[PDB]
Amino acid sequence: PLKVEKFATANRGNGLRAVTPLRPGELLFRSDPLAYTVCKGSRGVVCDRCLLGKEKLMRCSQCRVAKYCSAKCQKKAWPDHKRECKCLKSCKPRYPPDSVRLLGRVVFKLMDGAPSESEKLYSFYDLESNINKLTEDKKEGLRQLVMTFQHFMREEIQDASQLPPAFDLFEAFAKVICNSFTICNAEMQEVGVGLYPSISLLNHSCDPNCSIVFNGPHLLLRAVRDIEVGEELTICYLDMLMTSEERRKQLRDQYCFECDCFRCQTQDKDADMLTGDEQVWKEVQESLKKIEELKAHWKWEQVLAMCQAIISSNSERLPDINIYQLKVLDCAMDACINLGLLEEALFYGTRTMEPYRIFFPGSHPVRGVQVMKVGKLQLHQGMFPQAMKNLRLAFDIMRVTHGREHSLIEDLILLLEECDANIR
Ligand SMILES: N[C@H]1CC[C@H](S(=O)(=O)N2[C@@H]3CC[C@H]2C[C@@H](NC(=O)c2cc(C4CC4)on2)C3)CC1
Ligand SMILES: C[S@@+](CC[C@H](N)C(=O)[O-])C[C@H]1O[C@@H](n2cnc3c(N)ncnc32)[C@H](O)[C@@H]1O
Ligand SMILES: [Zn+2]
Ligand SMILES: [Zn+2]
Ligand SMILES: [Zn+2]
């Protein structure tokens, strides 16, 4: 039976609230996407279907754009790929914005597929569009997306009979911008984008009582605090390493709302996030645009070189609790992990631990993963007692944020045994 229900809130549209008391770690809902796709930078790096990396992928011949880890995935993806197959091939050699490819798959699922389990509580038809709050600048962008879609899909969709009844593309893209989820892999690297309309009922908080976590394209919604009957369920839509000014900008620009939460009212943690010389972190913030782009395209050598020039600069340096320094350390760590520079990865990862404890309070999946990464690095360098402490700490977080339904927990259970067997 459902532990959650749809309801009309006072001033934030529809929401989700608890029907029964909920405990930390309790599974509230699970869902495959209505539609999803690989994100721009991970295209040809991860499998289109399962969103896992592999040394070399098998590309679809029949369009030769979609890439797969296995014949299993390539064949199982064919139903939701066949029509975009015809389109991507016409397109060739142009690649569309992620939102266009995503909406393509939405339209095909709605036209050709059975009614989706992802739409149990709330459907794509029901999603918030915020059309009456859109600026003229944003509307212009949405008009370009509509024309991009029309061009991209001109092989498969020529008239209104091939869209759902009274389907409006402008409105559809408006729904996509404020309801799309960035799908992250087990390592918290961005790999996809998808729509999960039942999960779209959840409103935002900068200090939420629930969290989502991805296992491939599959999404698990879990409570991360005690929640009373009737209490609204919230998730944090945003990266935790953001100031209240930065959160304000994005929640306005993307989500068309003004956040009234305590953290936003008091600028909670902003001062600590911006410690160090302002001239220096301004330069690093600017440098991170390139670093993050390079990371998004899995260019670890270049990511590392840029991060090293900051972390071990011959000029002024920043404290590790500075959010821009902290992002640089994290990017450097993941680069070192993927270049097999494991000692250097551990130096960076270790340095992120205390800042992550502060900036990811309570039970947050991103901290759980970070601690697991540091524990895993220590385990494999034979630092068996420090590793056990971190892997147990990672488990205490991840038992709440991931749970037994997530396959990463099974991996973590094995590392507890493996590390436990070497010392204890
Ligand atoms: N380097 C960091 C970047 C951010 C991620 S994250 O896990 O913190 N991240 C996820 C969830 C929150 C934040 C930003 C993204 N958020 C969403 O995609 C999203 C969208 C929604 C609602 C439909 C609008 O709720 N969450 C992806 C960890 C690694
Ligand atoms: C993913 S939806 C959430 C469900 C939405 N309330 C609905 O009725 O469908 C995102 C939209 O909900 C609204 N929203 C989410 N969190 C909010 C908050 N803390 N305050 C005000 N509005 C919020 C905004 O309109 C936002 O663009
Ligand atoms: Zn696969
Ligand atoms: Zn194809
Ligand atoms: Zn807030």
Author numbering: 3 to 426
Paper quotes:
Structure-activity relationship studies of SMYD3 inhibitors led to the isoxazole sulfonamide series exemplified by EPZ028862, another molecule displaying similarly potency against SMYD3 in biochemical and cellular assays with physicochemical properties suitable for in vivo studies. In addition, EPZ028862 was tested against a panel of 15 methyltransferase enzymes to check the selectivity of the compound for SMYD3. For all enzymes tested, including the closely related enzyme SMYD2, no inhibition was seen up to 10 μM. EPZ028862 inhibition is best described as noncompetitive versus MEKK2 (Eq 6) and mixed-type inhibition versus SAM (Eq 5). Kinetic constants kon (6.1 ± 1.1 x 105 M-1s-1) and koff, (2.1 ± 0.57 x 10−4 s-1) were based on fitted values from seven replicate measurements (mean ± standard deviation). Therefore, in order to provide support that EPZ028862 binds endogenous SMYD3 rather than only the overexpressed protein, a cellular thermal shift assay (CETSA) was performed that reported a 1.4 μM EC50 for SMYD3 binding and verified target engagement of EPZ028862 for endogenous SMYD3. SMYD3 has also been shown to regulate MAPK pathways by methylating MAP3K2. Instead, cell activity of SMYD3 was determined using a previously documented engineered system in which both SMYD3 and MAP3K2 were cotransfected into 293T cells and inhibition of Lys260 methylation of MAP3K2 was measured. Treatment of NSCLC and other lung cancer cell lines with and without KRAS mutations at concentrations as high as 25 µM had no impact on proliferation. We subsequently extended these studies to a broad panel of 240 cancer cell lines (Eurofins Panlabs Oncopanel) across a variety of indications; again, no proliferative IC50 was observed for this compound in any of the cancer cell lines at concentrations as high as 25 µM.
Within the protein lysine methyltransferase (PKMT) family of enzymes, one branch contains five enzymes that share two highly conserved, functional domains: the catalytic SET domain and the MYND domain; these five enzymes are known as SMYD1, SMYD2, SMYD3, SMYD4 and SMYD5. Among the SMYD enzymes, SMYD2 and SMYD3 have been implicated as targets for a variety of cancer indications. In the current study we exemplify pharmacophore series for SMYD2 and SMYD3 that show low nanomolar potency against their targets and significant selectivity over all other enzymes tested with favorable physicochemical properties and pharmacological tractability. S2 Table Crystallographic data collection and refinement statistics for SMYD2 and SMYD3 crystal structures.
